[PDB]
Amino acid sequence: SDESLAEKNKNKLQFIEDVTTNADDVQRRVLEEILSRNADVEYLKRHGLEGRTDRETFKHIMPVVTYEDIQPEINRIANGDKSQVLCSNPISEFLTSSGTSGGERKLMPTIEEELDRRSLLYSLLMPVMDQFVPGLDKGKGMYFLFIKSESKTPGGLPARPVLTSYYKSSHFKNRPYDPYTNYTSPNQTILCSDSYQSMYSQMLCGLCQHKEVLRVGAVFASGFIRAIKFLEKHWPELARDIRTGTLSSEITDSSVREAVGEILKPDPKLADFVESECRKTSWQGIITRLWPNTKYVDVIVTGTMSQYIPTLDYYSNGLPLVCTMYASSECYFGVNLRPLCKPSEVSYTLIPNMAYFEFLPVHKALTEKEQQELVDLVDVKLGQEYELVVTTYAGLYRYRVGDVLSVAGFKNNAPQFSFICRKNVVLSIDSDKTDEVELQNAVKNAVTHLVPFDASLSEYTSYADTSSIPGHYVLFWELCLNGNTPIPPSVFEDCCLTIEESLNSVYRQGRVSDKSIGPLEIKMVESGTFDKLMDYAISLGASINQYKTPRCVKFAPIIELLNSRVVDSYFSPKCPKWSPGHKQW
Ligand SMILES: Nc1ncnc2c1ncn2[C@@H]1O[C@H](COP(=O)(O)O)[C@@H](O)[C@H]1O
């Protein structure tokens, strides 16, 4: 009903006003519920909280923690401990974060109830968008949504990414008919374990219903960029399926075949049109040509994903890029209340019902005083930067997420945050988040191949190259040759693979499982290249004694400068090794 939908939207927006006005009280209430329900859990009992639920005591008693501090408890639960270790409710599963510890995905505990809070955040997005872009209930959204690799812990609990867990839950699979969540992709195309068949069926379903499409997207920019690349490679096969009304024999999954069968009909004119647009040399504006009623591209382009803004603007011909929410495996955080703002102006308003949020000022061990005086959600100051600290319903207490956020403004009393970065992350193409330490150790393993040739790496840096789809990590190497035997290309290709083999499981899964990352490249640079970069820094006030070559570079003019001094480049000849789950298991 049009009246019931408008009433529902108005109530969700009034909920936002209520919780942003009474933000500190909602925060107080959330922490009280977490601490009363889990009063008798081992973690809080051993720290002496003694069933006290007040905020003042919690901040004085409980320590601020990293994943490594609580890994003993997490591993015990993963090995089968069903007692109340971190939570009074049973841990339903582990949500495997893209952030890693010891090169393995961090295991974030969750409880069945947490899906109600994830569904609450998702329920606020269309009521917010509807204010700015009306009429979205009269069409469909073409979203490319994917389930990723799953595994089981030794104790039998599922270990899977938060999005795979949500799509497989009844909150998404058995969701009620909402015209605002009417997607072109049937649930069976999303819930398909074969990534190729999932992408192929979703792209075909998207093309079959192209006139009904009012918005396009994916969770992340990289994933949507890959869907466009998939169409670049398979549009002749896909147009054939439209013309004949028969799905490709490569789609062997019977559940996908039945779901696609209820949409796919023979349509030679649509096939001719799809062929005519894709045949064109320039794909600038292919999204608006194939899906002409698209109002915006809905992908996250904040954080590392901002490197994709030029590619997305090319394929969309400058349609608005919309960043709707900020979330993690450990906790869903906030929504963007200005979805039509410019990507550089995006701020996320944290919803105080999700978790009890705390803020560590930034300008790593924390002093007793610093842990005690962590800033509450409503007390953060405009323009100041903070690390996000979270206390969740699923057994995390004063957990450092590692995200650095800046205060852009306030919605009533609730702060709005610009996303700065995930601390220490230097390279990323899709979900992979390679930190400076993983990279340094991967390069240290690779330079052992140069030792028999009496060669050494004088200096190196890196950047994430998005000139190709899927993107790849690029390493710039400057060698010091002290021997007489020239180094053959196979040795440098062995270095490329040795780096890849030492990178974390998310990087290696990206190369092996979903093909979201391309082969790593080592670009050799002329002698004196890194001394020329040092000359740029010395001119800008850097000392010779304090200068160290950065391990990673993002600023395009410096990447261009290094690329201009390249002699030869080498690529990894094969994928690194990868299998689902932790190597220990
Ligand atoms: N809207 C967003 N903009 C920028 N970074 C984001 C956004 N949403 C999630 N992230 C990052 O991804 C992390 C969660 O990764 P994961 O736990 O694998 O889902 C967050 O803590 C952020 O660092």
Numbering used by the authors: 13 to 375, 388 to 609
The paper states:
To investigate the spectrum activity of GH3 enzymes to form PAA amino acid conjugates, recombinant AtGH3.6 and AtGH3.17 enzymes were tested with PAA using a bacterial assay.
Superposition of both structures did not reveal rearrangement in the presence of amino acid (aspartate) ligand in the active site. Our attempts to obtain structures with bound products IAA-Asp or PAA-Asp were unsuccessful due to solubility issues of these ligands and a loss of crystal diffraction upon co-crystallization with AtGH3.6.
